[model samples]
Structure formats: C-alpha cells, structure tokens
Target: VSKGEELFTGVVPILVELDGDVNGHKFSVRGEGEGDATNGKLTLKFICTTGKLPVPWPTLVTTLVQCFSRYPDHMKRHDFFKSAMPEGYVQERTISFKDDGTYKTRAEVKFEGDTLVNRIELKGIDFKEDGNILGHKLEYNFNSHNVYITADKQKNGIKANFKIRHNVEDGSVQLADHYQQNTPIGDGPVLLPDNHYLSTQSVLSKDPNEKRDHMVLLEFVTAAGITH
Candidate 1:
C-alpha cells in the first residue's frame, strides 16, 4: 500500500548590519518537502518588511536558488548541485555602495511527492539623491521537475532554472539566461548565488588568481523526487 502525509517545511533568516547604522537588518528563507514512491521535491519562499529601513514601504524579493536533487542530503555543499545561469547573467547588475540603510527579509520552503517549485519576492527603498520612494518591488520565480537515473543510486541529477527581475527608471528590464545541469553536488543552499556575490564574481575575474572571484563548485541538495 502507498502512504501519504502532509509536506515538511523549514525556515531560516539571514541578518545584515552596516557600519554607522544603529539598527540591524534581517532576511528570511523558507523551505517545504514531501516523499513519494521514487523521489520527492522541495520549494522555498522569501519575504521582507520595510520597518527597518531609512524610510517605510520599500521592499525587494529575489530567488537565490532553484536546484534539483534526488535526496535531502544534497542541499548542503557547493560541490553537490549545478547552477542554472551562465557567466554573463550576474555581470550586468553590479553597483557600488551609494548610501547607508537597513531592512528586514523572510523566506519559506515546502516539498511534495515528485515535484518541486518555489517563489520569492522582496521590496526595498534605494537611498538616492532624489530621496526615498515607496512601493519598490523585486521578484523571482523558480520551479523544476526531476527524475532519478544513476547506477549506484547514490547519484541523481535534475535540470533547474530561476530568474530575477526588478523595477528601474526608463522602465528598463535586466534578465539572465536560464541555467541547467544534472549532478548531485552542483546545487546546494549555501552554494547558491546572491546578487552581490554573483555580480562581483561575473565581473571582477580577470586572471588566474582572480578566477576564485568567479569560479564556483556546483552542488545540489534538497532532492525529494526520484525512483529506484
């Protein structure tokens, strides 16, 4: 007989504090999962609030990772999973510090039988010479369907993709190519890219020693859907 149960969920928060700032800012991550006959899948969501900012009503939402896997242990390292974007994706959005500010963020994840999908959104106000504005938005949408295929059953892979879009003047839009790979150690939680890290890695690498600035070992953890 086949058994069915409600999905499992988890959440984590990341905090940031800047120099000369009296208040510290925070961000969150949420995850969910479930088990099926052969494999399972997990999804995550991110959220934020404007209370900690220099002003109110500014928010931003971005998807940090959307990977595929065959087991839960795959979510832990850089060498376990693969990323979905090419090198050029992060290079187009690099910017230097312009002012000081603070904000709060949150995220969530979930899992179900043999399917994985996730959505993350954030809002924040950018400090500019023009002053603070309200109702800024950023969002990311990611989802993947995976299958298990390996000899030892210890290695399974998936194809995954995610995107990030933000609002700017002149109604401009920036986009990155979708990334896909099939490997256990190529997609993990800590191994994924953040805006700052990806931007710097894609743009600052100029030589062999500088390669570390952009080079990353892929790993994929958070696998829930596969069959034996």
Candidate 2:
C-alpha cells in the first residue's frame, strides 16, 4: 500500500494576487512536506516574481479573505485568527522533526508601532483522515495543527490562536476556540479559515477607504496524494 516517493513527499502551491489593479503582480505560497508519516518535515515558502513589497498583517488578511470567501464569518467568530506578524518580507520558513517528534516554524515582523509573530506547530503525524484534492477525495491524514498569530499596536492589541484539529483516528475537521460575533464589516479586522483547497481572485472595490496599496490573487492546494 505504500507509494514510496509519492507517499513520502508532497508539494502544495498556494497562489496569491491582488484583488484589483491593472498592473498588480501575483504571489505564490508553497507548502511542501517530506519524509515518513511518523517523521515528516515541512517548509512553507512565499514567492513573488515581481518585486512588489509585502503588506501589513491586516491588509494581508483582507486580501486573503477575498481569496477565501468563507473566512469572514470565521474571523468574526475567533480573535486569535486575526492576530499576525507585522508587515515585512520573508522568502521562506522551515520546520524539521524534533527529538520529541514535533516540529514548528515561525516568522516575525516588527516596526515602530506594529508587530507580528506568526507560528505553526504540530506534534505526531498520520494521514488518516479524508483529504480532498484536485476533485478527488480520499482517506489520508493530517495532524491536529495550531496556528498562532500575535500582534501589538498601542492603538490596538491583537493575539489570536487558531486550531485546525481532527479526531486522532477517525476525526473530521474542526475549528476550536471560536466565539461568533455578528458584525458584518466594521467592528474590526477579519480573517479567513483553513481547509484542503482554495483558489480565487480578489474582488474589485472602489471605495477610497477600502482601497489597498496592493492586491493578491491566490490558490491553495490543500491536500492530495499522487501515484507512480
């Protein structure tokens, strides 16, 4: 049943582009995994062919929401989901298995009045759940994952923790630690939820207040298993 190299390695490409701008450039997010089920490794790389600078945490969240339409409701529900590393540019981040069988990767950005600390951590491994990819759904597995986003602004303090978890052997996707609020768009900044797959364009907005310095087009290949 083992698929050798196919089973041991995987690469997911996440596309990102601005919502609207005639000459806006696009970005890519690649989540690559390697090794065995019990000793896996991960590397998340963000790339942009053009030299457009990175945007703020809030601005990045807004653009991501456009790519993931269902994230607004989730953002309204959880606070940790909205906190993130401040605005800065980084090309890659990596996580290798630890002696205790866990791995973590983090990126941080800080400035005069803003700061962001972004991290992803996980322990143990098993592709034992239903993973859908490229229109195909199969029983693979992923672990209970945690994404911690922390930010600071004397003007606003944000610390968000998002948990993407599943049952040990037969569990389905679950978003833990969420408390829903009904405000549509004005109360505060909103964020998006995580899943196995996503691809979308940023919607055009004409409001000056809503105008963003940059936009992003994105695609996420959440999960898939290939065979030779």
Candidate 3:
C-alpha cells in the first residue's frame, strides 16, 4: 500500500484545490486518511459559497485535474471510452460540463478491455490529470467485477493498461489512486436543488468550474479507499 499512498498524494496533495470558481461558487476538496501508508483518513468534503452542494459528474473530472496529471493514468481516454464511441463499441463518451454554467467542458473517454482512455479537455482552461484506480473494504470486490485492463502508462502498480474496482458485496465501484479512496467522488449535485449533497454514478460526475482561471473544486463525500 505504500506505493498506493505515494501515488495518491502525488496527485491529490493534502489540500487538493481547483484554480478558480464554478458558476458563482468556489469549490474545494479535502481528504483525510492518516492511518494508511500516506498517513491520512479516507474522507473528503466539497464546499462552496452556497454551502454543501451536490457534486456534478463533469465537475468530478475537473477536480481530478489536481490529482492525477496524465490522461493515461486512470479515469480514461477516447480509445477505452464506450459511451462516446458508440460507433466502435469501444464506446467513447463525452459530456458538456460547466463549472460556472457558461462554458461547456467536454471530456471524452472510453474503456476497452485493456485501457481507459480519455481527455479532460478544458474549454476556457483550468485543471490537471490522470492515474490508477483504488478501493477499500480493502480494495474492491469491485476488482473482481472489473475486467482487467491494459494501457500505455500502466500507472500505480497494476498491470499495464489495467483498470480499477470495488467491493460492494459481489460488485461495486472502487476508488482511484489520486482521488480520495472511499470518498464518493460525484455522489452529489444533480443540478435541480443544487448541491445534491449525496449522489452517485458509474464513472462520471456533474460539471467543472469553467474558465482558464477558474479553480476546480471537486465535489464528493465518503471514506477514502485504497489503490492496487
């Protein structure tokens, strides 16, 4: 797990912060998982001027800019993306996510059996990059469910181009190396009531704080997890 801690912090940092604000809201993500190799807790909190809000899926992508610094590290890219590439079945998916509600930041990614390819392509300009997946309940029964993958970087310690997992009984989503462990990433903010407080998804978040100067404030709350 020592390798896990090093990789995670290398991406997230103690106070992983975005460059500016989303809409009129300024956001922030904090993780605490002191007992593990990194010596921190597995927790995170996203706060804005409006108070606690629901975390949008795309916004989760923006926050990751601070954690992992490369497209091939984790999250994904276009090649492995199945949703975006319906034309190929490898499925690459992209969404217009906005942090300030003005500019639409589109991230296209696809996960074929071997690699998760994606580009957190920023519009105005804002964040950073990518890495491996992680989990707890001790890394993931989610692992069992996630088919092994392979990619260029082969980040973390997993096999080249490998993917992440979970352990919610028979199957579930695991955590990423750079991001918080069990701390639900986009488990909030569905838009309507604003910060949803608690929401969840398969592999995406709500939105990002758009702008070259806007800081990325990732929204999510859950116990941090572990990486492979």
Candidate 4:
C-alpha cells in the first residue's frame, strides 16, 4: 500500500546450558528481510558463543577437547549431523518468484485393520525443490496426480502438512515481525518448532493407545511471505 521499501525481521534466540555446566550458551539468530517492488533480499546471521563446557577451564580449550570427543559420538548417532556437518553444517536455500502462487502440501498415514500406507501430495506448485521431514529425504514433484510422493514402511511414519499462499500485491515480508506480535521469541531455537503454529490431533479416538488402531495427525502450515 505504500511506495517505500518494507523491512522484515525475525530473530530466533537459543539459550542452552548443559546439565552440569555453569556458564550458559546463548545462541543469537538474526534474519533481515528487504523488500521493494521488484526484488527481495534476506540475510541471516547465526552468530553465537562458540561451543564450550563448564567453567574453570578456558572456553576455547574446553571446546577443543569436547569437539574431538563429542562430535565423534554425534557423527555416529545422528544421520543429518553426519551429512550436513561434513560440509561445515551450513544450510542454504534460494527463493525465486516467477509468479504469485498458492500451494498445499500434505503428508499423512492411515491404518486399515493392520495395514499401513503413507501418501503425500503437493497441490499447486509444479515441484518442491528440496526439504526434509523428521529425518527422511523429501524431494518430490506434483506436476500431475499420477506421479505423487509415496512411501512404504513396516510400522509407522510421521504425519506433516504445509500450505503456502503468496501474492505479489501483499506487502508482508517473509518472516514478518507482526506474526510474533507481543509474544516473546522464546528462549531458544528448539522452541521455534513448537506446537504453537501447527495443528495436532487424531482422527480416530479420543485417546490413542499404543496398539495403533487408527492414528492420524494433520498439520497445516502456511509459508507465504516473500514479497517486494
């Protein structure tokens, strides 16, 4: 509605302290958004206090020894840590806007008497670039209903959904500040993925037991903010 560039800011702070550590580590996340009418720019700075252990020893010294020991253990246990960390633990994404668009992404699992099948659909966009759900690789195309994203597993899988609707005329910045409104950004990045924005419920029973008769969770997330 205005003729000036709009600014958007989203900061994710993480305050963490181990079970026996004295000095806490506060991770600072700063992301800036620049919007005009033709192009967009977003820069994120993941500045934080480097890794360290309890007090007494020097910060750099503690991290030096811990990095050698703890990182080795983490490499063998976590899958993404092994892959993403090998390249310095950096995740990069590029967003381009060809046209104003809207899309819906749904991932669900259903149980029929003892059989389970998982199906995911992308409605609107031609292809989802690249992403991951829980720990599974997510690279799929929804150009046509025939070639959908599907998976088969023995027991169970994660249920997730995401919806996106963006318009060129909309002046909101991607990760605009108004979304958080008066709410505090929380203590850490771990709180960023909280259940506050998504829906969590079952389609079968009031209380889902361990038997896994029929459990369905539908999560709807709207990511429509990149604008100029």
Judged by whole-model lDDT over C-alpha atoms, candidate 4 comes out at 0.18
Model 2 backbone overlap count: 20
In model 1, which regions exceed 4 Å deviation? Answer: 1-24, 29-42, 45-79, 82-170, 174-228
- Comparing 1 and 4 by lDDT, which wins? 1
* lDDT agreement of model 2 with the native: 0.24
Q: For model 1, what is the alpha-carbon lDDT of residue 193? A: 20
68-149 in candidate 2: lDDT tens per residue?
Answer: 1122222322222222212322211222211111112222221113212222221212212232211123122233323333
Runs in model 4 lying further than 4 Å from the true structure: 3-26, 30-37, 50-228
- Please give the ranking of all candidate structures by TM-score, highest first, separated by commas: 1, 3, 2, 4
Model 3: how far is 209 from its true place, Å?
26
TM-scores vs. true structure, each candidate: 0.24, 0.21, 0.24, 0.16
For residue 72, what is the lDDT in candidate 2?
Answer: 29
- Model 1 agreement with the true structure over 1-228: per-residue lDDT tens digits: 101111212221222111111132233333233223123232222222223333221122122332233333332232122232111011011111123232222222222233333323332334343322222222222222232222222223333333323233345433322333333322322223211101101111113542121111122233432222
How much is the lDDT of residue 61 in candidate 3? 37
The residue-by-residue lDDT of candidate 4 on 138-200, one tens digit each, is: 111111111011111221111122322221123331110010111111221111111212211
- Model 2 / residue 212 / CA error / Å: 37
Q: Please give the lDDT score at residue 127 for candidate 1.
A: 36
